């Protein structure tokens, strides 16, 4: 009954990312290659302002990127707060495959990338520089999550061999403090893959996904018998109960999780309405809208 | 019956660290303050070569520190790959209490620390500089963890009010690649605290704890009803399984988990013999030896 291959990715642009991943998956390619190829599309696109090139800089005007990748056999790679490299997901893959470590950050991440042949490039576009200088006038930090403003791309897939893999990449919260790291490059937070169970990736206010260890929770729930959708929903309800305990207002928080199990069943859920995800399988590619907690 | 206050910490030096934490706990102080005070003792000690001052540098000769802290209400703070600040656990607490973020790395972490009044200091002792220059002769990276090598400090406590908190701090793997980050500053990996369940902290080959999201797993298992000891053991067993699946040899890996639940019950487990932990409660401070998987 397994439905494969299949790939899911976050937000409207995930539809286009899915097309690139499908080029690999539909030919029997590895899920690891498919998710890297898929998110690289968004990293390359200057018009996608929260991932790679064209990404909004931190408050010091520096574009620093974060990404992690995980394959079908517990191999992982991650880079955080790395500058000048357009495709951090690929540097993360290099960290995974070419070093005895699983996470490199800052200057050291760039140094490694360069040693691997990646090319130094100016990721700050004229548009981002302009918006940043404009923002500096009042310096009001107010993280907003949606197709406009903040987002990231997380992608998970099940290939023809029945193997799962995932990738997550972003330029992080616009105008963040220099050196700030969100959930996208943290294994178990922005992304988690267990080949015997399923995979999950999250998007939204990263700080909240980190404090709840979001994707590890989603996958563990699937391990405990929950369907992908129920797992995403239960995880969200956990951020909800936690958010209330911290005396915070749910309206100020947005998080979405998408998940896939070993059988190719998928699901998603979010705190607030307005989040969407793209799914591509034998029925084609489309954008779907999940359930939400804040009624 | 609830055993509180109580504090547990990793490795033999955890015994002396517990004495400092007990100064706070025995007076009815907050668990958050107790664990910060406890691990700061080790950060301050130049003779403890894998934590703060005196910590062995990365392969380029730079001492870069990592740490995270978590209180009783899901508040978290973390710094990774930060230089020149002797007490990263305290900068981590500042990230938690004074910023809209939960993790700062590299230059940005130092800049923030300085803005908060922390003082820049030379963390590379003459001894560490000497050993590093000696190591450079052959530059053979050999990740060694045991009773006398790479001993990070993770500390978790349950105070008189019945609240849990934890802290984890280290200088990382000796001669690591510049920018390498392990499990110590990652919430859900090196440390995790849920006041309605329990807390857990890890030590050892960090890469392995990150890939299994170790402490979140330990706490989630306690949520499912496992005793602290049972939870630590199963998390260790999950790493044992993954090491085998990745074609690696368990003899090259050491990971220890210690845990505490809301009732003050505690436990630990590790991969290889030789790992001890210290536990201090109203009956006294004890060096205890948990069970290990590698027979």
UniProtKB/Swiss-Prot annotation, chains A, B:
Cleaved into an alpha and beta chain by autocatalysis; this activates the enzyme. The N-terminal residue of the beta subunit is responsible for the nucleophile hydrolase activity. Substrate binds at residues 180-183, 203-206. It holds the Pfam family Asparaginase_2. One of its GO terms (biological process) is proteolysis. InterPro entries: Ntn_hydrolases_N (IPR029055), Peptidase_T2 (IPR000246), TAT_signal_bac_arc (IPR019546). Its main location: periplasm. It is found in: Periplasm. It is an enzyme of class 3 (hydrolase). GO terms for cellular component: cytoplasm; periplasmic space. Keywords: Autocatalytic cleavage, Hydrolase, Periplasm, Protease, Signal. GO terms for molecular function: N4-(beta-N-acetylglucosaminyl)-L-asparaginase activity; peptidase activity. The keyword Signal applies. The keyword Signal applies. The active site is at residue 152. It catalyses: N(4)-(beta-N-acetyl-D-glucosaminyl)-L-asparagine + H2O = N-acetyl-beta-D-glucosaminylamine + L-aspartate + H(+). Its EC number is 3.5.1.26. Heterotetramer of two alpha and two beta chains arranged as a dimer of alpha/beta heterodimers. Belongs to the Ntn-hydrolase family. Cleaves the GlcNAc-Asn bond which joins oligosaccharides to the peptide of asparagine-linked glycoproteins. Requires that the glycosylated asparagine moiety is not substituted on its N-(R1) and C- (R2) terminus. This is N(4)-(Beta-N-acetylglucosaminyl)-L-asparaginase.
């Amino acid at each position: 009954t397994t439905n494969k291959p299949i790939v899911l990715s976050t937000w409207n642009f995930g539809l286009h990312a899915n097309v690139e991943a499908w080029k690999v998956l539909s030919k029997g390619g590895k899920a690891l290659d498919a998710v890297e190829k898929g998110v690289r599309l968004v990293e390359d696109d200057p018009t996608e302002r929260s991932v790679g090139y064209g990404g909004r800089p931190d408050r010091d005007g520096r574009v620093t990127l974060d990404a992690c990748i995980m394959d079908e056999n517990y191999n992982i790679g991650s880079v955080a707060c790395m500058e000048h490299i357009k495709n951090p997901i690929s540097v993360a893959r290099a960290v995974m495959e070419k070093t005895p470590h699983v996470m490199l950050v800052g200057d050291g991440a760039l140094e490694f990338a360069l040693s691997q042949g990646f090319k130094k490039e100016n990721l700050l576009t004229a548009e981002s520089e302009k918006e940043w200088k404009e923002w500096l006038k009042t310096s009001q930090y107010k993280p907003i999550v949606n197709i406009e403003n903040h987002n990231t791309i997380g992608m998970i897939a099940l290939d023809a061999q029945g193997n799962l893999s995932g990738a997550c990449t972003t330029s992080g919260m616009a105008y963040k403090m220099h050196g700030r790291v969100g959930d996208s490059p943290i294994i178990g937070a922005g992304l988690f893959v267990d080949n015997e169970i399923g995979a999950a990736t999250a998007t939204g206010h990263g700080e909240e996904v980190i404090r709840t260890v979001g994707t590890h929770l989603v996958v563990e729930l699937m391990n405990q018998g929950r369907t992908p959708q129920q797992a995403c929903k239960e995880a969200v309800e956990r951020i909800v109960k936690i958010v209330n305990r911290r005396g915070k207002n749910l309206k100020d928080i947005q998080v979405g999780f998408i998940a896939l199990n070993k059988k190719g069943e998928y699901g998603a859920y979010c705190i607030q309405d307005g989040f969407n995800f793209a799914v591509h399988d034998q029925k084609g590619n489309r954008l779907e809208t999940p359930g939400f907690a804040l009624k």
